[PDB]
mmCIF file of C-alpha atoms and ligand atoms in Angstrom:
data_model
loop_
_atom_site.group_PDB
_atom_site.id
_atom_site.type_symbol
_atom_site.label_atom_id
_atom_site.label_comp_id
_atom_site.label_asym_id
_atom_site.label_seq_id
_atom_site.Cartn_x
_atom_site.Cartn_y
_atom_site.Cartn_z
ATOM 1 C CA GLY U 1 0.000 0.000 0.000
ATOM 2 C CA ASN U 2 2.978 2.327 0.589
ATOM 3 C CA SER U 3 1.381 4.935 2.725
ATOM 4 C CA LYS U 4 -1.858 3.009 2.750
ATOM 5 C CA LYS U 5 -0.419 -0.385 3.594
ATOM 6 C CA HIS U 6 -2.482 -2.874 5.482
ATOM 7 C CA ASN U 7 -1.958 -6.592 6.024
ATOM 8 C CA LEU U 8 -5.487 -7.886 5.714
ATOM 9 C CA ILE U 9 -7.339 -11.204 5.684
ATOM 10 C CA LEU U 10 -10.953 -11.417 4.498
ATOM 11 C CA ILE U 11 -12.817 -14.514 5.871
ATOM 12 C CA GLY U 12 -16.356 -15.257 4.832
ATOM 13 C CA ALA U 13 -18.520 -17.963 3.274
ATOM 14 C CA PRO U 14 -17.759 -19.056 -0.294
ATOM 15 C CA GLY U 15 -19.666 -16.534 -2.362
ATOM 16 C CA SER U 16 -19.772 -13.744 0.231
ATOM 17 C CA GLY U 17 -18.373 -10.990 -1.997
ATOM 18 C CA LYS U 18 -14.599 -11.042 -0.920
ATOM 19 C CA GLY U 19 -13.174 -10.843 -4.492
ATOM 20 C CA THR U 20 -15.726 -8.088 -5.317
ATOM 21 C CA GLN U 21 -14.483 -5.995 -2.333
ATOM 22 C CA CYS U 22 -10.831 -6.792 -3.227
ATOM 23 C CA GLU U 23 -11.259 -4.792 -6.412
ATOM 24 C CA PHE U 24 -11.673 -1.510 -4.466
ATOM 25 C CA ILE U 25 -9.196 -2.571 -1.779
ATOM 26 C CA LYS U 26 -6.401 -3.268 -4.370
ATOM 27 C CA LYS U 27 -7.050 -0.078 -6.157
ATOM 28 C CA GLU U 28 -7.665 2.298 -3.236
ATOM 29 C CA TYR U 29 -5.073 0.944 -0.798
ATOM 30 C CA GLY U 30 -2.422 -0.477 -3.311
ATOM 31 C CA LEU U 31 -2.429 -3.919 -1.713
ATOM 32 C CA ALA U 32 -1.536 -7.222 -3.387
ATOM 33 C CA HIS U 33 -4.703 -9.313 -3.674
ATOM 34 C CA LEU U 34 -4.034 -13.003 -2.987
ATOM 35 C CA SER U 35 -7.048 -15.188 -3.754
ATOM 36 C CA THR U 36 -5.818 -18.724 -3.441
ATOM 37 C CA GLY U 37 -8.893 -19.844 -5.550
ATOM 38 C CA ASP U 38 -7.855 -17.550 -8.382
ATOM 39 C CA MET U 39 -4.180 -18.645 -7.910
ATOM 40 C CA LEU U 40 -5.256 -22.271 -8.191
ATOM 41 C CA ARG U 41 -7.398 -21.580 -11.307
ATOM 42 C CA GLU U 42 -4.264 -19.816 -12.777
ATOM 43 C CA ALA U 43 -2.055 -22.837 -11.793
ATOM 44 C CA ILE U 44 -4.634 -25.108 -13.483
ATOM 45 C CA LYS U 45 -5.223 -23.104 -16.756
ATOM 46 C CA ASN U 46 -1.458 -22.952 -17.342
ATOM 47 C CA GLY U 47 -1.513 -26.813 -17.251
ATOM 48 C CA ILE U 48 -1.122 -28.608 -9.909
ATOM 49 C CA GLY U 49 -3.388 -29.807 -12.769
ATOM 50 C CA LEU U 50 -6.195 -32.370 -13.062
ATOM 51 C CA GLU U 51 -6.381 -33.660 -9.556
ATOM 52 C CA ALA U 52 -6.461 -30.069 -8.101
ATOM 53 C CA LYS U 53 -9.070 -29.336 -10.835
ATOM 54 C CA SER U 54 -11.343 -32.118 -9.718
ATOM 55 C CA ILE U 55 -10.989 -31.253 -6.015
ATOM 56 C CA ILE U 56 -11.957 -27.575 -6.737
ATOM 57 C CA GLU U 57 -14.886 -28.509 -8.953
ATOM 58 C CA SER U 58 -16.138 -30.987 -6.160
ATOM 59 C CA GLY U 59 -16.048 -27.968 -3.696
ATOM 60 C CA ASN U 60 -13.483 -29.567 -1.429
ATOM 61 C CA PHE U 61 -10.342 -28.079 -0.081
ATOM 62 C CA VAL U 62 -7.033 -28.569 -1.764
ATOM 63 C CA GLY U 63 -4.208 -29.695 0.579
ATOM 64 C CA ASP U 64 -2.940 -27.202 3.230
ATOM 65 C CA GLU U 65 0.617 -27.687 2.052
ATOM 66 C CA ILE U 66 -0.159 -26.909 -1.573
ATOM 67 C CA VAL U 67 -1.834 -23.612 -0.771
ATOM 68 C CA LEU U 68 0.693 -22.625 1.911
ATOM 69 C CA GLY U 69 3.385 -23.236 -0.849
ATOM 70 C CA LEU U 70 1.654 -20.853 -3.236
ATOM 71 C CA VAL U 71 1.187 -18.132 -0.585
ATOM 72 C CA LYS U 72 4.745 -18.488 0.759
ATOM 73 C CA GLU U 73 6.037 -18.171 -2.840
ATOM 74 C CA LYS U 74 4.295 -14.714 -3.069
ATOM 75 C CA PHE U 75 5.801 -13.512 0.190
ATOM 76 C CA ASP U 76 9.258 -14.840 -0.710
ATOM 77 C CA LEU U 77 9.215 -12.988 -4.118
ATOM 78 C CA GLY U 78 8.406 -9.581 -2.372
ATOM 79 C CA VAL U 79 4.804 -9.339 -3.726
ATOM 80 C CA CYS U 80 3.444 -8.519 -0.251
ATOM 81 C CA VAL U 81 5.889 -5.928 1.141
ATOM 82 C CA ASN U 82 3.544 -3.104 0.236
ATOM 83 C CA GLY U 83 0.572 -4.737 1.993
ATOM 84 C CA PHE U 84 -1.801 -7.487 0.998
ATOM 85 C CA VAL U 85 -5.341 -8.693 1.195
ATOM 86 C CA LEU U 86 -5.765 -12.518 1.548
ATOM 87 C CA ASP U 87 -9.093 -13.756 0.225
ATOM 88 C CA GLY U 88 -10.091 -17.341 0.873
ATOM 89 C CA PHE U 89 -6.820 -17.993 2.756
ATOM 90 C CA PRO U 90 -6.355 -19.076 5.344
ATOM 91 C CA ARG U 91 -9.369 -21.302 5.370
ATOM 92 C CA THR U 92 -8.202 -23.938 7.931
ATOM 93 C CA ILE U 93 -6.420 -23.656 11.258
ATOM 94 C CA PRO U 94 -3.157 -25.323 9.854
ATOM 95 C CA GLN U 95 -3.150 -22.600 7.154
ATOM 96 C CA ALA U 96 -3.579 -19.842 9.782
ATOM 97 C CA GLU U 97 -0.668 -21.285 11.808
ATOM 98 C CA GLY U 98 1.394 -21.681 8.584
ATOM 99 C CA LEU U 99 0.696 -18.033 7.773
ATOM 100 C CA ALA U 100 1.697 -16.897 11.319
ATOM 101 C CA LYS U 101 5.120 -18.651 10.656
ATOM 102 C CA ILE U 102 5.536 -16.978 7.289
ATOM 103 C CA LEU U 103 4.833 -13.535 8.803
ATOM 104 C CA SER U 104 6.966 -14.341 11.913
ATOM 105 C CA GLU U 105 9.905 -15.123 9.646
ATOM 106 C CA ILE U 106 9.749 -11.694 8.044
ATOM 107 C CA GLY U 107 8.841 -9.725 11.169
ATOM 108 C CA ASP U 108 5.654 -8.378 9.573
ATOM 109 C CA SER U 109 2.258 -8.852 11.273
ATOM 110 C CA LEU U 110 -1.456 -8.742 10.373
ATOM 111 C CA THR U 111 -3.314 -5.442 10.542
ATOM 112 C CA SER U 112 -6.924 -6.575 10.513
ATOM 113 C CA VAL U 113 -9.080 -9.579 9.710
ATOM 114 C CA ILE U 114 -12.542 -8.755 8.339
ATOM 115 C CA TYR U 115 -15.291 -11.364 8.621
ATOM 116 C CA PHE U 116 -18.105 -11.065 6.032
ATOM 117 C CA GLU U 117 -21.331 -12.127 7.789
ATOM 118 C CA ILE U 118 -23.929 -13.559 5.405
ATOM 119 C CA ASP U 119 -26.253 -16.521 5.511
ATOM 120 C CA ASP U 120 -26.236 -19.609 3.272
ATOM 121 C CA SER U 121 -29.551 -18.892 1.506
ATOM 122 C CA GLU U 122 -28.324 -15.516 0.283
ATOM 123 C CA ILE U 123 -24.989 -17.105 -0.791
ATOM 124 C CA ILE U 124 -26.938 -19.466 -3.073
ATOM 125 C CA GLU U 125 -28.544 -16.399 -4.727
ATOM 126 C CA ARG U 126 -25.098 -14.673 -4.957
ATOM 127 C CA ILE U 127 -23.462 -17.698 -6.719
ATOM 128 C CA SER U 128 -26.455 -18.395 -8.961
ATOM 129 C CA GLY U 129 -26.102 -14.995 -10.720
ATOM 130 C CA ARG U 130 -22.309 -14.948 -10.922
ATOM 131 C CA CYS U 131 -20.169 -14.781 -14.000
ATOM 132 C CA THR U 132 -16.503 -14.217 -14.260
ATOM 133 C CA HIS U 133 -13.856 -12.753 -16.588
ATOM 134 C CA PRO U 134 -11.399 -15.726 -16.538
ATOM 135 C CA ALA U 135 -8.148 -13.835 -17.354
ATOM 136 C CA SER U 136 -8.468 -11.202 -14.586
ATOM 137 C CA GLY U 137 -10.758 -12.967 -12.139
ATOM 138 C CA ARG U 138 -13.172 -9.983 -12.223
ATOM 139 C CA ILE U 139 -16.692 -10.988 -11.199
ATOM 140 C CA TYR U 140 -20.175 -9.739 -11.995
ATOM 141 C CA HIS U 141 -23.713 -10.649 -10.946
ATOM 142 C CA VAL U 142 -26.530 -10.596 -13.504
ATOM 143 C CA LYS U 143 -28.934 -8.981 -11.020
ATOM 144 C CA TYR U 144 -26.889 -7.048 -8.375
ATOM 145 C CA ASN U 145 -23.612 -6.126 -10.112
ATOM 146 C CA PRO U 146 -23.908 -6.513 -13.871
ATOM 147 C CA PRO U 147 -21.367 -5.829 -16.595
ATOM 148 C CA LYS U 148 -21.815 -2.431 -18.270
ATOM 149 C CA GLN U 149 -22.254 -4.131 -21.678
ATOM 150 C CA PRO U 150 -24.082 -7.503 -22.058
ATOM 151 C CA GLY U 151 -22.104 -10.654 -21.726
ATOM 152 C CA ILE U 152 -18.657 -9.041 -21.584
ATOM 153 C CA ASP U 153 -15.964 -7.772 -19.284
ATOM 154 C CA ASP U 154 -15.986 -4.004 -18.598
ATOM 155 C CA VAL U 155 -12.209 -3.625 -19.025
ATOM 156 C CA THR U 156 -11.340 -6.028 -21.961
ATOM 157 C CA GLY U 157 -14.660 -6.631 -23.730
ATOM 158 C CA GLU U 158 -13.875 -10.370 -23.483
ATOM 159 C CA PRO U 159 -16.700 -12.862 -22.746
ATOM 160 C CA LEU U 160 -17.828 -13.652 -19.229
ATOM 161 C CA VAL U 161 -18.016 -17.302 -18.306
ATOM 162 C CA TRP U 162 -19.424 -19.853 -15.819
ATOM 163 C CA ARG U 163 -17.277 -21.373 -13.029
ATOM 164 C CA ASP U 164 -17.387 -25.126 -13.024
ATOM 165 C CA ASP U 165 -17.472 -25.240 -9.250
ATOM 166 C CA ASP U 166 -20.720 -23.262 -9.247
ATOM 167 C CA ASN U 167 -22.757 -26.452 -9.681
ATOM 168 C CA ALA U 168 -25.351 -27.329 -6.977
ATOM 169 C CA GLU U 169 -23.504 -30.238 -5.301
ATOM 170 C CA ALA U 170 -20.184 -28.340 -5.073
ATOM 171 C CA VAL U 171 -21.986 -25.255 -3.590
ATOM 172 C CA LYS U 172 -23.264 -27.574 -0.872
ATOM 173 C CA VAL U 173 -19.721 -28.949 -0.274
ATOM 174 C CA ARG U 174 -18.255 -25.476 -0.240
ATOM 175 C CA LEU U 175 -20.714 -24.251 2.378
ATOM 176 C CA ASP U 176 -20.376 -27.430 4.505
ATOM 177 C CA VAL U 177 -16.532 -27.382 4.638
ATOM 178 C CA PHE U 178 -16.652 -23.605 5.257
ATOM 179 C CA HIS U 179 -18.834 -24.079 8.403
ATOM 180 C CA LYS U 180 -16.770 -27.075 9.646
ATOM 181 C CA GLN U 181 -13.180 -25.904 8.892
ATOM 182 C CA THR U 182 -13.109 -22.182 8.070
ATOM 183 C CA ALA U 183 -15.605 -20.696 10.519
ATOM 184 C CA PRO U 184 -13.273 -21.583 13.548
ATOM 185 C CA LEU U 185 -10.886 -18.991 12.223
ATOM 186 C CA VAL U 186 -13.216 -16.248 13.401
ATOM 187 C CA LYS U 187 -12.442 -17.148 17.050
ATOM 188 C CA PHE U 188 -8.749 -17.704 16.166
ATOM 189 C CA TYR U 189 -8.516 -14.072 15.069
ATOM 190 C CA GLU U 190 -10.850 -12.588 17.688
ATOM 191 C CA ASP U 191 -8.439 -14.140 20.245
ATOM 192 C CA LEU U 192 -5.653 -12.086 18.662
ATOM 193 C CA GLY U 193 -7.893 -9.002 18.922
ATOM 194 C CA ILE U 194 -7.701 -8.084 15.243
ATOM 195 C CA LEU U 195 -11.073 -9.299 13.839
ATOM 196 C CA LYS U 196 -13.899 -6.959 12.790
ATOM 197 C CA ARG U 197 -17.235 -7.957 11.062
ATOM 198 C CA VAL U 198 -19.148 -6.430 8.175
ATOM 199 C CA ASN U 199 -22.684 -7.097 7.070
ATOM 200 C CA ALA U 200 -22.084 -8.744 3.727
ATOM 201 C CA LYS U 201 -25.860 -8.999 3.062
ATOM 202 C CA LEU U 202 -26.010 -5.335 2.121
ATOM 203 C CA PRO U 203 -25.551 -3.882 -1.377
ATOM 204 C CA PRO U 204 -21.945 -3.891 -2.627
ATOM 205 C CA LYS U 205 -21.367 -0.163 -2.136
ATOM 206 C CA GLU U 206 -22.615 -0.320 1.447
ATOM 207 C CA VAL U 207 -20.326 -3.211 2.176
ATOM 208 C CA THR U 208 -17.443 -1.118 0.723
ATOM 209 C CA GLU U 209 -18.369 1.736 3.142
ATOM 210 C CA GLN U 210 -18.287 -0.608 6.075
ATOM 211 C CA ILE U 211 -14.941 -1.877 5.040
ATOM 212 C CA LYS U 212 -13.549 1.656 4.680
ATOM 213 C CA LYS U 213 -14.636 2.320 8.295
ATOM 214 C CA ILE U 214 -12.499 -0.502 9.519
ATOM 215 C CA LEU U 215 -9.381 0.213 7.335
HETATM 216 N N1 AP5 I 1 -6.903 -21.663 1.154
HETATM 217 C C1 AP5 I 1 -7.388 -22.657 0.401
HETATM 218 N N2 AP5 I 1 -7.303 -23.967 0.933
HETATM 219 C C2 AP5 I 1 -7.802 -24.974 0.249
HETATM 220 N N3 AP5 I 1 -8.518 -24.942 -0.896
HETATM 221 C C3 AP5 I 1 -8.609 -23.654 -1.465
HETATM 222 C C4 AP5 I 1 -8.123 -22.574 -0.766
HETATM 223 N N4 AP5 I 1 -8.434 -21.479 -1.598
HETATM 224 C C5 AP5 I 1 -9.111 -21.958 -2.629
HETATM 225 N N5 AP5 I 1 -9.306 -23.359 -2.475
HETATM 226 C C6 AP5 I 1 -9.993 -24.172 -3.442
HETATM 227 O O1 AP5 I 1 -10.416 -23.401 -4.588
HETATM 228 C C7 AP5 I 1 -11.811 -23.211 -4.597
HETATM 229 C C8 AP5 I 1 -12.069 -21.796 -5.263
HETATM 230 O O2 AP5 I 1 -11.835 -20.881 -4.181
HETATM 231 P P1 AP5 I 1 -12.463 -19.437 -4.455
HETATM 232 O O3 AP5 I 1 -12.235 -18.975 -5.904
HETATM 233 O O4 AP5 I 1 -11.989 -18.609 -3.355
HETATM 234 O O5 AP5 I 1 -14.019 -19.757 -4.257
HETATM 235 P P2 AP5 I 1 -14.939 -19.711 -2.962
HETATM 236 O O6 AP5 I 1 -14.165 -19.940 -1.757
HETATM 237 O O7 AP5 I 1 -16.171 -20.568 -3.281
HETATM 238 O O8 AP5 I 1 -15.375 -18.088 -3.006
HETATM 239 P P3 AP5 I 1 -15.862 -17.223 -4.217
HETATM 240 O O9 AP5 I 1 -14.658 -16.826 -4.968
HETATM 241 O O10 AP5 I 1 -16.959 -17.966 -4.899
HETATM 242 O O11 AP5 I 1 -16.465 -16.052 -3.345
HETATM 243 P P4 AP5 I 1 -16.109 -14.472 -3.144
HETATM 244 O O12 AP5 I 1 -16.220 -14.232 -1.696
HETATM 245 O O13 AP5 I 1 -14.878 -14.183 -3.890
HETATM 246 O O14 AP5 I 1 -17.390 -13.768 -3.793
HETATM 247 P P5 AP5 I 1 -17.466 -12.915 -5.138
HETATM 248 O O15 AP5 I 1 -16.852 -11.541 -4.957
HETATM 249 O O16 AP5 I 1 -16.999 -13.726 -6.227
HETATM 250 O O17 AP5 I 1 -19.010 -12.637 -5.194
HETATM 251 C C9 AP5 I 1 -19.966 -13.755 -5.543
HETATM 252 C C10 AP5 I 1 -21.116 -13.063 -6.307
HETATM 253 O O18 AP5 I 1 -21.860 -12.099 -5.537
HETATM 254 C C11 AP5 I 1 -21.849 -10.783 -6.313
HETATM 255 N N6 AP5 I 1 -21.803 -9.809 -5.265
HETATM 256 C C12 AP5 I 1 -20.678 -9.393 -4.555
HETATM 257 N N7 AP5 I 1 -21.080 -8.519 -3.615
HETATM 258 C C13 AP5 I 1 -22.442 -8.363 -3.716
HETATM 259 C C14 AP5 I 1 -23.425 -7.720 -2.900
HETATM 260 N N8 AP5 I 1 -23.040 -6.987 -1.856
HETATM 261 N N9 AP5 I 1 -24.731 -7.822 -3.272
HETATM 262 C C15 AP5 I 1 -25.098 -8.666 -4.331
HETATM 263 N N10 AP5 I 1 -24.213 -9.381 -5.090
HETATM 264 C C16 AP5 I 1 -22.879 -9.311 -4.726
HETATM 265 C C17 AP5 I 1 -20.687 -11.006 -7.177
HETATM 266 O O19 AP5 I 1 -20.916 -10.139 -8.279
HETATM 267 C C18 AP5 I 1 -20.640 -12.435 -7.619
HETATM 268 O O20 AP5 I 1 -21.622 -12.635 -8.613
HETATM 269 C C19 AP5 I 1 -12.264 -23.450 -3.206
HETATM 270 O O21 AP5 I 1 -13.626 -23.814 -3.148
HETATM 271 C C20 AP5 I 1 -11.331 -24.638 -2.896
HETATM 272 O O22 AP5 I 1 -11.717 -25.836 -3.676
HETATM 273 MG MG1 MG I 2 -13.485 -15.176 -4.973
#
């Protein structure tokens, strides 16, 4: 971020609007956005291939060690020195501990963890309208956050596309493993005294204003 550096984690249900908020956070605060789901889809599309692909499209978690490898690689290259926002990582307690080691080894620390509160029925409506620009990871919603022109990305004009993990059985998996494995991280970070909550059910601009109040 330079003068606007923060070291931020967003935790929230699959589908809660973290990558949408990361667009303003990257741009306003100059932070590196690390979505390990987008990082995995980029490791896939460049041919961590078919087995990771199936695991993601089933809605299950990829191995802790695989994702900790990809995050550590960003930190080791210097991508995060100007601040970062982690989105979808950590999502298990071994990943949180692995991250604490990575930060301990550089002497940096977390600024804030922001927990997006939203219920599972609204997440199903958020995912059902989603489409994505695959090269950039930008996301739109056909009802609540549409592209400016039909069917295409606002920046490149390239087509928007479906995500294969947005099928009904994987949405159920994603929500189930989130409540079992990821939700415990809210106490993990409240115990460190750095967790704040936002009402992710509100319209996207109102969620952005709540986030700005915390940053
Ligand atoms: N650490 C890790 N460990 C192990 N496995 C890992 C892992 N990280 C990744 N994985 C694996 O990879 C998979 C993919 O991970 P990932 O790509 O992170 O998927 P996810 O966890 O299911 O989360 P999403 O990306 O779907 O949600 P989001 O919070 O980014 O919401 P978005 O802004 O898109 O918004 C959704 C929709 O809502 C719209 N929207 C946003 N805000 C609003 C609003 N306020 N009102 C109405 N609509 C809204 C959006 O336009 C969009 O249509 C995981 O399921 C797992 O298999
Ligand atoms: Mg996302």
